[PDB]
């Protein structure tokens, strides 16, 4: 029942006179905001992305980030000049808060350098993590001398994050509780092992994320079933495949069973070798170029 809100910033510094900063904001697995380097304005990716905040409340918050983006860029490159008078440099920020029932939350601000987590804002200051390069000590000391920033970050983590997200959760309640029915189909590919076959159960178009997919022989769940990774669709729905390795001839009798919250107890059951399966397969026949390698 918990929802994680995250602002993700990626900054690139190729040399002394080149930089770009791009950001995305996610509430759970729904994108709420976008902030391209090209744009002077933070953009909404939802009609409810403002939350419960007023226009004047939003402008003051955006202005703060606008001052931040310019300042961050200049601060990094001035710190580069301190340490290596190396390049290129990649910096990532993960800022936000996780929500818990009821009215309680924990905030975070993580910073990575070259793809390794090195610094976090903790309490009232910046802190290096355990196992971090010792050259960071000086930049940290330099940055911790800024009381104005410390206060502003504290306000954003302790107060502003939870206040905004609660507003987002009420504003976007309808989209978060939205139900989308999955569709499934069957295919098969050669296994890497000689004489074997890999049956694929494609499950696509479902929302929300949680799903159950298993290959069955009647009442028996096949313990060889392998869930793949969740893969996104462009319309914010999800794709997943469940594979099963079988010896040639043991395909018959098998079924792919899918359980989802949008189905309401009425599971999708696709049987291998059924009339339905034969019809779908002949609608997707092709020349098999340039199929994925098999060895």
């Amino acid at each position, epitope marked *: 029942k918990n929802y994680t809100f995250r602002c993700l910033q990626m900054s690139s510094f190729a040399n002394r006179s080149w930089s770009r900063t791009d950001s995305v904001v996610w509430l759970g697995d729904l994108q709420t905001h976008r902030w391209s380097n090209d744009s002077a304005t933070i953009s909404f990716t939802k009609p409810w992305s403002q939350g419960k905040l007023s226009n004047q409340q939003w402008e003051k918050l955006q202005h703060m980030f606008q*001052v931040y983006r310019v300042s961050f860029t200049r*601060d990094i490159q001035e*710190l580069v000049k*301190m340490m290596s008078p190396d390049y290129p440099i990649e910096i990532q920020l993960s800022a936000g808060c996780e929500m818990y029932p009821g009215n309680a939350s924990e905030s975070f601000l993580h910073v990575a350098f070259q793809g390794k987590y090195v610094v976090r804002f903790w309490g009232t200051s910046w802190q290096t993590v355990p196992g971090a390069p010792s050259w960071l000590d000086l930049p940290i000391k*330099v940055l911790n001398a800024d009381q104005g920033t410390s206060a502003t970050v504290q306000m954003l983590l302790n107060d502003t994050c939870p206040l905004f997200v609660r507003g987002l959760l009420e504003a976007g309640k309808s989209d978060l509780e939205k139900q989308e029915k999955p569709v499934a189909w069957l295919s098969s590919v050669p296994s890497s092992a000689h004489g074997h076959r890999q049956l694929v159960c494609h499950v696509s178009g479902f929302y929300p994320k949680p799903v159950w997919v298993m290959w069955m022989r009647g009442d028996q769940e096949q313990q060889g079933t392998h869930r793949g990774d969740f893969l996104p669709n462009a319309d914010e729905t999800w794709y997943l495949q469940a594979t099963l390795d079988v010896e040639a001839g043991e395909e018959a009798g098998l079924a792919c069973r899918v359980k989802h919250s949008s189905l309401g107890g009425q599971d999708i059951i696709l049987y291998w070798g059924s009339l339905h399966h034969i019809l779908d397969a002949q609608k997707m026949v092709w020349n098999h170029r340039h199929h994925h390698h098999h060895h």
Partner: T-cell receptor
Amino acid sequence: TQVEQSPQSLVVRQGENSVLQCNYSVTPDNHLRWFKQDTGKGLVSLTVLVDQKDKTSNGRYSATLDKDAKHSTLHITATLLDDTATYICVVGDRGSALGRLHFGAGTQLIVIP
Amino acid sequence: AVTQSPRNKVAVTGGKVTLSCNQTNNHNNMYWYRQDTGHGLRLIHYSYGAGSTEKGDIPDGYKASRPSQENFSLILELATPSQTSVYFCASGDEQFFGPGTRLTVLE
């Protein structure tokens, strides 16, 4: 120029009060500092203004800062002869070592006996 | 306290000029400004410590050198008449300004 001072120069009678203005467009505006420069000498700090609405006082000198207006005022109460100097308005854009100071041309104060 | 030498210098066009700046404040950051009527101090070169030297807003015609924490130098390889000004040096951990150097470059 991102830091403008008015007037260019000011003539005041000894013992009266003199008012000096500062207007800036520096972003961000961390702090504002007033300096006094005697002829043929260096810059010597008079006072620092840090807060959004700030007021400061040091003997005859008293200053105010309004960050929403990006405006500052330096008051010299009961001006003396040795107060004849250039007064310079300085805005710093960081509260750290990575800051850059922005300077105004200065107001020349002439105290006539 | 911040010291500068020389305090006054008369130079020729195409000559070499080296302005010195010493501070015992033990500051890391050091700055070099010049002052001209109707402007306000403008940054020539600055340093973040021993070995560091960075371009300011107006670095053209000027070089800088930081051999140690205490010393920061402004070097004019081929002096020009436009480089006639009053030069101020500064140091910071708030900046502390030196007494200034009057330089006249003549034809």
